[PDB]
């Protein structure tokens, strides 16, 4: 059969786009030219959410290792400016990253994202709801921004300091031409695709309990809102576009649903971990699998109703 799609390559496609269509996610890793020892975790958060009436609630599904998404609310029409986005963690954080995020790189030292998808499955009554679900995608990137701090020494010394920060957060207030707008009763289903030519690995960051680190002003970091990870901590940003889900619920409207978030991440096991025993080799390069990935990704819609998932 000369050259066809390697099974893992084909499975990579199922994993990336149609995550919930099979018995179990066929995530055998990424048919990328890296065949080193990896430990793939297929994260999935199934949670019942009830949207607060009279407000837009932002569910920012960003590619951050242990965190499922960042949630924030604002009045209908208001700006998510000062508004911080709080982490909604994928189950089993303390197990992988640890209690205090100073242990964070103890089981896994690096990561790289394979899939990322989200779905809102409305459980409201047909005569109970009102509202809309809108999905667009934001291209957030991590940066090392500069700022100067004047310290109260006798002759006040100014320090040229820096902080890690995420770009493009202003998009929280935008509805681009690439959006999905629809009634609430038909939730959504959306996936993200790698925004770089190659799937490079990223180190697991320790000591970050919020994007603009503790003691750095939002404005010093040059970002527009901040990301706060309570308990869990900021581990890094993967190479995928954040899926932005905006559920705007009117006053008196009872919009309840089941939020599901999927994410198969390939992690590099720390030899000192007990988990480095479940680790397997990343699948072999499959140029055809990767070719279809980029094509399919170009022809699918931004989001779909939770019925064509």
């Amino acid at each position: 059969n000369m050259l066809k799609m390697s099974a893992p390559g084909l499975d990579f496609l199922k994993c990336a786009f149609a995550s919930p269509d099979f018995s179990t996610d066929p995530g055998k890793g990424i048919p990328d030219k890296f065949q080193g020892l990896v430990l793939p975790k297929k994260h999935c958060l199934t949670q019942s959410i009830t949207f607060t009436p009279g407000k837009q609630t932002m569910l920012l599904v960003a590619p951050i290792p242990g965190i499922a998404c960042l949630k924030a609310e604002a009045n209908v029409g208001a700006s998510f400016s000062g508004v911080p986005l709080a982490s909604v963690e994928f189950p089993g954080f303390d197990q992988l990253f640890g209690t205090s995020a100073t242990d964070t790189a103890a089981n896994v030292t690096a990561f790289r994202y394979a899939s990322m998808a989200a779905g809102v499955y409305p459980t409201s009554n047909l005569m109970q709801f009102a509202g809309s679900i809108q999905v667009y995608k934001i291209p957030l990137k991590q940066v090392l921004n500069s700022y100067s701090q004047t310290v109260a020494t006798v002759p006040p010394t100014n320090l040229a300091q820096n902080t890690i920060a995420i770009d493009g957060l202003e998009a929280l207030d935008a509805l681009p031409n690439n959006n999905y707008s629809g009634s609430f009763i038909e939730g959504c289903y959306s996936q993200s695709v790698c925004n770089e030519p190659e799937f490079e690995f990223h180190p697991i960051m320790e000591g970050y309990a919020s994007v603009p680190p503790a003691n750095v002003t939002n404005a010093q970091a040059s970002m527009f809102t901040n990301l706060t990870f309570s308990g869990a901590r900021y581990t890094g940003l993967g190479d995928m576009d954040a899926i932005a889900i905006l559920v705007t619920t009117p006053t008196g409207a009872v919009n309840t649903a089941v939020l599901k978030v999927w994410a198969c991440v390939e992690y590099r096991p720390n030899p000192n971990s007990t988990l480095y025993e479940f680790a397997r080799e990343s699948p072999a390069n499959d140029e055809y699998a990767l070719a279809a990935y980029r094509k399919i990704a170009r022809d699918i819609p931004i989001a779909v109703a939770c019925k064509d998932n």
Partner: peptide
């Protein structure tokens, strides 16, 4: 219409195009 069948129709449509 499972997203997979949707996906299938796409590469079935003709991903043959190229690869190297």
């Amino acid at each position: 219409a499972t997203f997979w069948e949707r996906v299938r129709s796409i590469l079935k449509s003709g991903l043959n195009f190229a690869s190297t």
